[model samples]
Target: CVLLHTSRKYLKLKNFKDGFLAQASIVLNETATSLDNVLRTMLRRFADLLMAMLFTDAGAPMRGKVHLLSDTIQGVTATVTGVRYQQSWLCIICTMKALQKRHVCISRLVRPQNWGENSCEVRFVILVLAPTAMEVARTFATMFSDIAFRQKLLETRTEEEFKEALVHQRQLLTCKDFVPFGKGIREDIARRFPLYPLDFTDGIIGKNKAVGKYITTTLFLYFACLLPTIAFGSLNDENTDGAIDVQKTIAGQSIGGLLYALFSGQPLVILLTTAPLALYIQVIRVICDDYDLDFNSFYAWTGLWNSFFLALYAFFNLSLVMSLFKRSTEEIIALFISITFVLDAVKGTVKIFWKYYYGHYSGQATAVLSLLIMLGTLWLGYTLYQFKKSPYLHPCVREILSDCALPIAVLAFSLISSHGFREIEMSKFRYNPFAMAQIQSLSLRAVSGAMGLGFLLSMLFFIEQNLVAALVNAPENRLVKGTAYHWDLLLLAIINTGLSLFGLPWIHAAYPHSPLHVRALALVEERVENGHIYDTIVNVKETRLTSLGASVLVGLSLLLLPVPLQWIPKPVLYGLFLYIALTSLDGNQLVQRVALLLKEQTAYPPTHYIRRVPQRKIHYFTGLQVLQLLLLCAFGMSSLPYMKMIFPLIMIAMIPIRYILLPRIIEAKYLDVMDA
Candidate 1:
């Protein structure tokens, strides 16, 4: 108990300040034999020089305390007696109330070589002396324990850079004020207005400087955005019986995306027509067919009404309602989209096989080749994405490989699919550039019906659009400039209102793509903990350039229709979808919790939730979440009349479920940790 308490005291400090250290020194690539010899000869000599600066007189009271500090180092060295350990560094601290100030010295060994009988291979050594040195030692230990930070420290070229790194780490650990949630409409708009100019300035300037990352990210999202636009366009066409086809979907996305990027508050968000919106469009078609109304006119009126409600909601700051959504609701929706992508890819693959085997025998080879292409694309993309963590290759090259993983995978597999199966009949990109749709006319009866359905569509958009905005501006994504939720909603209302004129599909923030957009432009540092690779965002490239550039590319594809795009197989796109879905699921807490179900208690990762919540309670919470997710999926996919159309309401119900019911089942303290 004494030892544990001492250890805790040695490592429990918080909010460490760089100002506490009077001097910082660094020694690079030093050749040393014994740890004691290195410390007494090199480290002690530097410490005495620093101490001389602090205490001028040889007989000063503080000068006497320096011996006590030396004795503390001797005590640490005596305890550290044998060399069969894995850790490559040691932290030694000495503190005395008599001491007037603090000093730190860092040493980097020439190579991973044993410096003492008790150490494995002391790659680095940190020695701190302070009036209250334990706290400073704890802070140093915390900083050094981070694999990425440790690497950064080792690679630093000079002492100033080393101090700068420490300063950066200190800043990272410093607390920042949280934006108060559920602010009034007036306050929300007022708060965002001041941040508006900084957003555009920062975005434009960032893109101007980081041209390479901007171009790579733009190219990557161009392919990512294009595939979905085409795929969803095809789906809408089939559902609406060719009334709303691929070309219109393409044009609508290209136009709406360009506008959204140019004017929206959150340019990091990528807009598209999602599956739920498509389903709603199909329902509109069904209703119009049943009532003998013009489909295009009815669609236009419905969209106009929906636009009215969206604008109304934006003006009222109804997006603030999203503040009620905690991590539970946010993660559920994210996981749903991720799983939806996976299921879509699988469904596409299965359809190819079913179409071949069930209908005709000659397509057997085609089906097999398509399946291989899909799996190959997925494998190659995932592998390349993981190259950032691999031991091989330069760090810059690895980063490039990771950043361009999907695009490279798509290009490579596209080549193989095109050339290797020249004779095989396979599905290719299908589109018609000239195909267009228009709203004919509207009547009072159609207007009334459209108003009613418009209310429903508005409700759907209220949840879907705001939820995507919330996810994109999610705290975990580390967006720094600020969010303009009200501004963004208003922009959506304006853009969709214009799209209503031509009966084009309304576009809003679409996920995994929206969150994925933020991720693609982020600077990530790969960290290894417990043999697991975790990608941590160092910074995000918050810019309008990538989205704007990608949208321009989407527009250009309209001019060059069915040329290069048509050659890319549908199966390869499916593979891209699979890759996206799988990659986006990386940090989902629900997915992590699900895996914990089968893991033994001892092996569980030491996450914050695990530290406070009991294992049994965690399992119970996870089970309930799984049940809710299953219910949501069932309701969403059910073929029962109107079940799919009311999916938004079903999602909104979870808010009350989380607020009212969850606290009754689990203690608020425990629930907050899991939710957080």
Candidate 2:
């Protein structure tokens, strides 16, 4: 009673001292099942505590693990753990041997953590240590299939025929059309001479179509895509916001992504420091700070688990799970992302002007200069991109000038402003470029909490990666070959894991950059679909030179341009950021798809689906999707100090909205025809 009272006291106050006291009380209470069971619980909890303490040095504390070993008997014992976690295996072996003499075999698993909080029947089995491959399979299979001892463990028991009946009977919500798994790395390793398409012959190898397009895309992406995502990512993350180390973060993401690309099968799938991940890390940081938990250890554990889980996913060809997100779902997700980018850009651009108004005075030359320069930059960049179709311009001239547009715009505007108008000063910057990676905590417990959150992270990465791949690899974008989603994502998972350890931002495929790479390689021809004009990729001038060149340039800039970046005003970058966001609106298929509802009945733009699907059906689909998009937008906008942690989860909620709500709301024929 005293132990219980004291533990309750500690738990309510919520401190380290209380935590240990509570653990002791809980351990004691757990041991009350029986005299022998008391020994079992005490020994096990004590062992767990020791493991937690020993491993807690790295800042990763173990949450707690309950390992149930099956023996020839129902005999139970709580063995103390080893100092080294690996040595615990030996402890298990000894425990099994000691309990062997009084064997009374059972046939179920000790506990099923994945079974959730529902009541579950426990089972025991004859566990064995395998000496050979054959023995390993025997023991593993016996242990796995033992789930038969318990019913209701699997989620959803609807028979296949019955399930189809529901969908056929217009119970659209029950339909399961999405692929829930995909190809594995091992399968790729076995096929063809070059298993994973690491050469120039396969379009997966990063390639540039023309030397001009290569340079052009590099410039466009640097200014429009890469820089904006970097700035937005760093600025939004409160942890990095105070440092305002945009250059450093840029270097980290670029150099890190380059390293990832060099070793991975799909180098062209450009990884940027994505927004969701940046905010995800920030949310974790906030929670840790609030609770006095070690952020480093927690972050490391999440990354560690992410790597392991994704690797396992790849090994099992579970990449297809991404397919569960249909076009209706993906469209909303893309819109949410696009809107955030655009909105952030708007905020960034206006905030500077507002600061000047609040800091000094409005209507100053500074404002005029900032505004003029931004417009000029936009115009020049646009002209360069659009001039490819100019009737009078030479083809080579068009390619070179347009490809060189962004750099030229920046240099020209910066030079004019700095040299002619005013000697604008740079933002002074300082940082330690080289430092050992450190995590305040690293333990089994760190990985434990992270294990649950890792799945959420996986789903996010899966959505972004596959979405980019889908947009870029559509049949319209003709290519010499295709890219491997599973291999590239696996590589990204591995890369993200490494970055997480060092407390760097997680990188995933950037939408704009991924498509830009595809566009740069493909030879496009104008075509019409349902009265809507579109580009059909005729062929690809595949080469690795663009990615290599761009990556190398990025690395060198990190080495050389840290000081130069400060010279560029924050407002200019904001403008460029706004430019990408605004420009994306022009090409966004989702935006166009939605516009159909507002168009005059007769003049509604023709596209494959727009022409084929019933007019009312299109509006219904569009309206439903727009409502979801608006809801997501509101949720996303609410993320400042409020609801940021849950924001990512909200974004994921769209999956079910499409899966369940949309199907039930919209007719099946419309959904089947309209949704991708």
Candidate 3:
């Protein structure tokens, strides 16, 4: 409580000490299930605190004049954080510094455009982490699976969600000045002491479904699984020279991923082995061997440099992508996945042809010429077919083929030149440059290779996979719930709008499923005057904060590009990568399980959030999506020029398809929806 003087209007200076101490107690007392867990959380939070501090407005909201195209746009979001925060006591001090930090960040995250033209209030929410938050989320997730309760859950929001519902946030909110923490109040009381405090604070939070327990256990098990996942396909190939110590490689990967996941600041993050990370490890390993170099010698500095550049870029607001190329979740994800897969597939196919014939120079040249023409013809065909269709055997295949008419034309043209009796590779021809270019593309530098890979995996940022993007984007309330942050949907909107920041890629949180998953998982819960709960989310935070945490994590990770760890084997990573593909499919059930008979008996759809989606149906839908993604990925790895185009084309095609599909499904399934 604050020390008041004459009236409750102003807090006395003397009260500040106790207030500071109280806030400190809450900050310092923070604990995770394990010490390692605590350390990891602190390291991350230190960064979070720092970011919070840097962006904070100690003096006032909307006061600091941020420069245009400034890195402050992104860095200002969370201005202060770094590795220096490992010490517990120092970390404590850092947390204390956050009150001003909070003010600054909140101010920076948003500002009143009209300023003095109109009065305003900043909206905020206070939450307790130790006991209640975890329990409530779990309770909602579990109990609310019942259709009736699920339907009614969002029909009425909990006491808080009702307060923050907005037509917009992180974008433009015309209805303003409803700050979560009023200008005069400290949020600690609201979070720690329920508005209506009770001796049984235990009632609001529970033991069986304690968040602390679920989080710690999940993290431990996740890393345990990740080790093997890291080791999966590492050994066999990397052992090439018989001089290789495969164990070290395995050690590095295992330790590296483990540390990243462990320190990634809590559970919502999925740390499955990503293909890009694995590839990077492999590339680094080869560099180590060829130079007989010490990886440790440069790794730390390299990481430091990357982090440095990332920070500098953020501070300067020079990130290329952040400022440009914004897309809706679905569109961005589709581009990322499709373009990468298709390009890779085409590039891979060219390689096999070279491998089989390249050793024979004359045959190689002929084959190379033929291949080029083939590629060129295919490309031309696709371009032409955009205008005219050449019917193929099957309608679906034909439609697919039409999109690649350009590639088809390249193929036919190449064949005509090489096989249709064009003049031989005369010594005077001396066109090795052209052939060399093709060789590289077909081999190590396949056109469909790294670049496509980079594009495809960019999905890591845009698509829903793990924590980084998810958490950063999560709204404040949901940060620790089913998602990583309390509010992230707004974050995505905010950052993307700057169209002025660098982009590593975009990503979202994987709540039991993806955004689509959660949307279908539960309906919006609203409250009634009678204090009854109904399934109707008047607010968006209930679902989107998970994305925010993940995004913030990814952004901060750019700072600590490499965490300390040894390598895991390639075999292990292959297994892990494949496992990711496998497990990602888990959502299939949730995505497509539309029929609610079992849900009526089990999860109780038609109520709470379950009313929005039946788990069984969701699973089916997500499963189908998984299958399609796999097929895209598989073809990408294969020798197909056209694979590069399929994903993009499909993404292009799917927008309307899904748009049409979603409404139809809703209409067919829901008796209450006004429109299908």
Q: Estimate each model's TM-score.
A: 0.75, 0.63, 0.29
lDDT of 3 by residue, 1-676 (tens): 3232322121111111112112211112232433233334444542432222322233342455421110110000111111111000110112232243221100110111111101111111112122122332222222222223322222333323322221111012111222332221223223323322221221225322223322332333333332333232232123222222223223333333333333222223333333333333334344445555433322222222333333332333222223122222232344333333233333333443454356522656644554454344434543544332222133234333433333334334534554464563311110110001112212233222334433333333233332334423344323322322222222332322221112111122333223322222222322111122112222221211232333333333333223311211111122223223323322232222333334453433223334454555545444544555555455433334345323434433444544466447544353122111
lDDT of 1 by residue, 382-477 (tens): 999877565335546876786678878888888888876788878865565432234446678878878888887887778877777887877757
The models' CA-based lDDT, in order, is: 0.70, 0.51, 0.29
Candidate 3 regions off by >4 Å?
A: 1-219, 222-226, 233-270, 275-456, 459-587, 590-637, 641-676
| Model 2 stretches astray by more than 4 angstroms | 1-183, 191-226, 229-239, 242-244, 292-298, 350-355, 360-402, 423-437, 440-454, 480-482, 527-534, 605-615, 640-642
Name the regions of candidate 1 deviating beyond 4 angstroms.
1-8, 11-23, 26-103, 106-208, 289-292, 386-398, 434-440, 443-445, 476-478, 523-526, 535-541, 606-616
Question: Model 1: how far is 540 from its true place, Å?
Answer: 3.7
| 1 against 2, candidate with superior TM-score | 1
Q: Which candidate is the best by TM-score?
A: 1
